[PDB]
Design a protein around this ligand. Structure first.
Ligand code: HEM
Ligand code: HEM
Lengths: 60, 51, 379, 54, 101, 80, 51
């Protein structure tokens, strides 16, 4: 039985054009996920010290 | 350019059409990703969360 | 048929420069900095260009334009601090590159070494003129002092310094002249770097052993393109650390006040990458002697190849020469520290001793030590 | 604190971008280092021999 | 005397080109005279020099050192290039002396 | 052409029995050849050649012989 | 530079000293003319009529 890495090469990494598409699609999803995660970390560290955390009191 | 109007070049095209199509998709996905088109990214299930 | 990479003229040049260039297989990480320098240069050209899209070179609108870049321009602070700290990274890499050339006997490439010395002079001038552009207190007064140095030249000193000033002192004329020169010089630096690589590729590259490596040459691309990419990534990590966590670490705060010709800042000192020279400049009480010592402190690199009295090229197998080289490095660090410090009781004497030690090591101790090493090996 | 904001209006965004760049660099440096090791293993593992016919 | 021999042997050990298997004449800077001397070497000596230098370069690429028992001993370090280099230098000196007058 | 002569035919018979266990008639060889077309050639070459690690043996003045990394990179196409 | 210490080199210096002196005179006159030194040009009869 082929391993997961073997499947990845045969289906996506064997041909460079498919290799490029995997990177392009991966970059799209990675950017959203990484930014969302990184923002969560930064906002958690600075909880209650950002405008987005204190605007509710002064907004409206 | 009648030099290329032959059966072999017709076969040559068919062999490289899937590859050219794949590279075109890479360009399309790259352009949408780089420019954040959002005409197309609205359809994308997880990316549409942004904006 | 042929190969486009090896046949097309531009492709021929590129292939023979960065793709199929025979390179020594054992060059350490100290050979990365060269490429890093180029990277830095390109960065300074790009970043600086985007600063020129918002910077105006008028004394009434220079500091305000810089604050406009830092506050209003989108990601303007990113670009501004990239430029400011990339100059410092450029000089770190330049000093490490010159140290690598000294240690491994790379100055035996006379033409390459001389073009490198010219590059060092040009980059120092570019950075000095660029630091004046913000038109802060430090910019104005450092420009004042460094330019006034030229007045020590006999006979033609005053006329020369006034010609460079564009007037009677550092003023709007000087600011605009410096902006123009600062814009133009990096392109001359790129041309000189291209000539530098042209001269270097004539004889290949040296290796840490200092022994000709024609038997063990490897293609440049698959190995040293990825190695230089990794080195550039590490340099970019350090530069982004500086930009995003301590953007003002290497800059004196007094440059954030607008230039006041009628009031001096509490302490006047140039950027760190000049301090060592500044230190030597202050070691000599005489003005002309101080300027000559400052010039010699960098022209000594020209003499470096002619002082090589060792039978071996690299200091790798020369432990006494290694001790002298590290004494020289520590002496340069001491000179930088003293140049940062004011002129008072201990600092004056320590700086004078440090300058004497620097010139003594480069001119006297190193050749004598090399001769002693040659004797010990029965050459 | 207000004066700190006034002098550095990009403070918070700068810290955020620094965190993102730290994460990206901690991800990338091992990866590019591994790519360099992959390319250089051909030379690192190579074994030379000297066979004079004499 | 033996004091000079001791300090010379200490320096030879300190200058770690023996740790790479090299010999003293393998580390000399290849200027014009050294290049001409190399050109005059017999084939076996030239091949031995080439292999020793290549092996040293490989070791420095791997940032490693030869096993302790494979280091070049000071007493068995042979100055193979010295005679040829001396001859080349004498010939150059003769040509320069003729050029003086 | 290789099967012209008693000695070549004997060699073919012996080698075929040792390897295949049977003597493949020329008719079967021709049928197998006729089965081959451009698509089959492309598929099999991709299976055995495209992006595969080769074994290289050089001998003589082979200083210009490309480095193994360069040869391996040559074993695949970026355009494809 | 002991290689260049010999009778032939002294003969060479003797031969090329007039040429070197002429080129030095050319350089001095060119510098004075280009800079309009007026420390030297005051002595020149017709030129000192200027300024
Ligand atoms: C080797 C190349 C270069 C070096 C070493 C260099 C160095 C510097 C330095 C140290 C500063 C002072 C920044 C500060 O104190 O905040 C500066 C400012 C500046 N440079 Fe560059 N520079 C280079 C190339 C360029 C180029 C090519 C351009 C334009 C095309 C440029 C445009 C500017 C401008 C407009 C400023 C003023 C903006 C500011 O100070 O924020 N520089 N440069
Ligand atoms: C903007 C300034 C400079 C640039 C862009 C530059 C660029 C380079 C590059 C790309 C290399 C080849 C890579 C390497 O050998 O590490 C190199 C090598 C070299 N550079 Fe520079 N360099 C600069 C300044 C200097 C200076 C200031 C010196 C000496 C004072 C110098 C002397 C040398 C020498 C001797 C080599 C050959 C070293 C060897 O091959 O072992 N360069 N330079």
């Amino acid at each position: 039985a082929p391993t997961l890495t073997a499947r990845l090469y045969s289906l996506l990494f064997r041909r460079t054009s498919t290799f490029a598409l995997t990177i392009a699609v991966g970059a799209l999803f990675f950017e959203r996920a990484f930014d969302q995660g990184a923002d969560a970390i930064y906002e958690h560290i600075n909880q209650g010290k950002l405008w987005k955390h204190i605007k509710h009191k002064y907004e409206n | 350019l009648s030099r290329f109007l032959g059966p072999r070049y017709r076969e040559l095209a068919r062999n490289w059409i899937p590859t050219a199509s794949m590279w075109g998709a890479v360009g399309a996905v790259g352009l949408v990703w780089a420019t954040d088109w959002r005409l197309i990214l609205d359809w994308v299930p997880y990316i549409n969360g942004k904006f | 048929m042929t190969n486009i990479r090896k046949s097309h003229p531009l492709m021929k040049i590129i292939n023979n420069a960065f793709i199929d260039l025979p390179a020594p297989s054992n060059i350490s990480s100290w050979w990365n900095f060269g490429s890093l320098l180029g990277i830095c240069l390109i960065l300074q050209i790009l970043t600086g260009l985007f600063l020129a899209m918002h910077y105006t070179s008028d004394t009434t609108t220079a500091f305000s334009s810089v604050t406009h870049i830092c506050r209003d321009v989108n990601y303007g602070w990113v670009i501004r601090y990239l430029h400011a700290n990339g100059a410092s990274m450029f000089f770190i890499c330049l000093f490490i590159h010159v140290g690598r050339g000294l240690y491994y006997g790379s100055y035996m490439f006379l033409e390459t070494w001389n073009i490198g010395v010219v590059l060092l002079f040009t980059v120092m001038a570019t950075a000095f003129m660029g630091y004046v552009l913000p038109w802060g207190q430090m910019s104005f007064w450092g420009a004042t002092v460094i330019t006034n140095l030229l007045s020590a030249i006999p006979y033609i000193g005053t006329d020369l310094v006034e010609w460079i000033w564009g007037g009677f002192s550092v003023d709007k004329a000087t600011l605009t002249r410096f902006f123009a020169f600062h814009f133009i010089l990096p392109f001359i630096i790129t041309a000189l770097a291209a000539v530098h690589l042209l001269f270097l590729h004539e004889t290949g590259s040296n290796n840490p052993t200092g022994i000709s490596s024609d038997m063990d040459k490897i293609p440049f691309h698959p190995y040293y393109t990825i190695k230089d990419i990794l080195g550039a990534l590490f340099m970019m990590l350090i530069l982004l650390i500086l930009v995003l966590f301590s953007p003002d670490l290497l800059g004196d705060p007094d440059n954030y006040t607008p230039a006041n010709p009628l009031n001096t800042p509490p302490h006047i000192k140039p950027e760190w990458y000049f301090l060592f020279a500044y230190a030597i400049l202050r070691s000599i009480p005489n003005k002309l002697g101080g300027v000559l010592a400052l010039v010699a402190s960098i022209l000594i690199l020209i003499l470096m190849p002619m002082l090589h009295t060792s039978k071996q090229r690299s200091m790798m197998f020369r432990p006494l020469s290694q001790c002298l080289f590290w004494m020289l490095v520590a002496d340069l660090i001491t000179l930088t520290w003293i140049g940062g410090q004011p002129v008072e009781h201990p600092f004056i004497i320590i700086g004078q001793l440090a300058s004497i030690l620097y010139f003594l090591i480069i001119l006297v101790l190193m050749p004598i030590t090399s001769i002693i090493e040659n004797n010990l090996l029965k050459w | 604190t207000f004066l700190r904001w006034a002098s550095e209006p990009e403070h918070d965004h700068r810290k955020r971008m620094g965190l993102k760049m730290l994460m990206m660099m901690g991800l990338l440096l091992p990866l590019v280092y591994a790519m360099k090791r992959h390319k250089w293993s051909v030379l690192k593992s190579r074994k030379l021999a000297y066979r004079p016919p004499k | 005397s033996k004091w000079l021999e001791g300090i010379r042997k200490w320096y030879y050990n300190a200058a770690g080109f023996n740790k790479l298997g090299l010999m003293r004449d393998d580390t000399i800077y290849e200027d014009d005279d050294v290049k001409e001397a190399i050109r005059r070497l017999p084939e076996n000596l030239y091949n031995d020099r080439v292999f020793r230098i290549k092996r040293a370069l490989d070791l420095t690429m791997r940032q490693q050192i030869l096993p302790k028992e494979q280091w070049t001993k000071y007493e068995e370090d042979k100055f193979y290039l010295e005679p040829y280099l001396k001859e080349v230098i004498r010939e150059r000196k003769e040509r320069e002396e003729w050029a003086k007058k | 052409s290789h099967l012209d002569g008693t000695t070549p035919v004997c060699e073919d018979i012996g080698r075929s029995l040792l390897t295949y266990g049977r003597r493949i008639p020329l008719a079967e060889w021709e049928s197998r050849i006729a089965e081959v077309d451009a698509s089959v050639v492309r598929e099999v070459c991709s299976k055995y050649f495209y992006d595969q690690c080769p074994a290289v043996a050089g001998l003589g003045p082979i200083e210009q012989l490309p480095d193994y990394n360069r040869i391996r990179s040559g074993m695949f196409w970026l355009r494809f």
